[PDB]
Ligand binder design. Structure first.
Ligand SMILES: CC[C@@H](C)Nc1cc(C(=O)N[C@H]2C[C@H]3CC[C@@H](C2)N3c2ccc(C(=O)C3CC3)cn2)c(C)cc1C(N)=O
Length: 209
């Protein structure tokens, strides 16, 4: 059963801004999303210093990028802490207002991650997103959205089990399909995410002839 919720007004306004801006360095979306993954992996790793059974839901700590060319979808999966349904309905934090203000004063989009709202840079290159997530002691959910208006949260009894962590599915814009290319992904990872302290896997798929 689907639950529908409205974005705060400032989030809808941020989305509309990002999805329509003409920024010439849109590749930074991948850095912002890998930084969120890294942070989520740090959080589970450090909780597990007190309580190592927290890692049992998925013993590997990794980041995994899966272009799906048939679907025009770029997936980014991590085995970090994940998000509770509460994180998914009410959000985490106000970073959103503080970043539109910042843009007003000439701030660069590349600085979105200083304000904790790096997730939304994905709308530089995508017009729809699914967030699949699984937190310890809660269920697996799909959060889904176009850019502005409503988002939905749905109990996930259909998809592959994450074990623990998060998978973003970016539905790429027709002008940004280069982020399905292996060499483009590799060089953007190496340029902006060179010092991430977790392995970054990239899946290349030979599709059936
Ligand atoms: C603890 C996780 C953190 C370290 N990393 C991540 C953070 C995020 C992230 O930003 N999600 C938030 C919460 C959810 C899911 C996407 C988006 C932003 N949503 C919402 C939800 C609600 C609202 C609202 O208007 C409120 C109703 C009024 C706005 N936005 C993500 C997506 C992943 C990771 C990660 N890879 O693990």
């Amino acid at each position: 059963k689907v639950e529908t919720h409205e974005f705060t007004a400032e989030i809808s306004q941020l989305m509309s801004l990002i999805i329509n801006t003409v920024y010439s360095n849109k590749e930074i979306f991948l850095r912002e999303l890998i930084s969120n993954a890294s942070d989520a992996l740090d959080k589970i790793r450090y909780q597990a210093l007190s309580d190592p059974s927290q890692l049992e839901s998925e013993p590997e700590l990794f980041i995994r990028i899966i272009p799906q060319k048939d679907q025009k979808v770029l997936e980014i999966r991590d085995s970090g802490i994940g998000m509770t349904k509460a994180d998914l309905v009410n959000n985490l934090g106000s970073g959103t207002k503080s970043f539109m203000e910042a843009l007003s004063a000439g701030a660069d989009v590349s600085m979105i991650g200083q304000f904790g709202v790096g997730f939304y840079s994905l709308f530089l290159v995508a017009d729809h997103v699914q967030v699949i997530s699984k937190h310890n002691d809660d269920e697996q959910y799909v959060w889904e959205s176009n850019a502005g208006g409503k988002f939905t949260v749905t109990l996930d009894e259909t998809n592959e089990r994450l074990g623990r962590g998060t998978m973003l599915r970016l539905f790429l814009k027709e002008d940004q399909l280069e982020y399905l290319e292996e060499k483009r992904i590799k060089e953007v990872v190496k340029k902006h995410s060179e010092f991430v302290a977790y392995p970054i896997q990239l899946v290349v798929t030979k599709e059936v002839e």
